[PDB]
Amino acid sequence: GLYEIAPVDLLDETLKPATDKKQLSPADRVFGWVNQRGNGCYKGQLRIHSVTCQHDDAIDDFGNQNFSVPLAILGQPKPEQARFYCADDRKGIPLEDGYDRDDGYSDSEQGLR
RNA sequence: ACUGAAACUGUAGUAGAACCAAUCGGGGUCGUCAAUA
């Protein structure tokens, strides 16, 4: 089955990424912005530079240069799991327990987590 | 009912002045998929 509402519609227009230079929120001003939908950009006011490691033997050689720990499974995020990704109110309230999946992305007054 | 002759379209003049190839982005991470008996 398809849920009735696309997640983009459960996000408030004031929270979607900015679409003009007038609506730049604090992080868009501090870190900068580029419009993904047309013209518009702003160079960020915060610049990170001169990163240096102070320790010399900082990397963990596990014992030989050819060792390698196999690293669990980093699976892909799956927002179809509405009980994890969807919220009952645009304040980000988790969904109620016990309701069937048809409830997930249901009302327009639902929200994202 | 006696052709005028002779005469460099030439001389001087910088396609140049100003202009940032640049703005934003963690090499990151979990539950799905199939429909019947």
Shortest CA to C1' contact from A46: nucleotide: B24
Structure obtained using: cryo-EM
Tokens of A45: 């006011």
Give residue numbers, 23 to 62 of A, with CB < 7 Å from strand B. Answer: 31-34, 36, 41-44
Residue with tokens 């990170």: A48
User: What dihedral angle (degrees, nearest 10) is formed by the CA atoms of A83, A85, A86, A92?
Assistant: 120
A108, A7 Cβ separation under 8 angstroms: no
- C1' of B5 to CA of A36 (Å): 83
Q: Cβ atoms within 10 A of the Cβ of A95, count?
A: 20
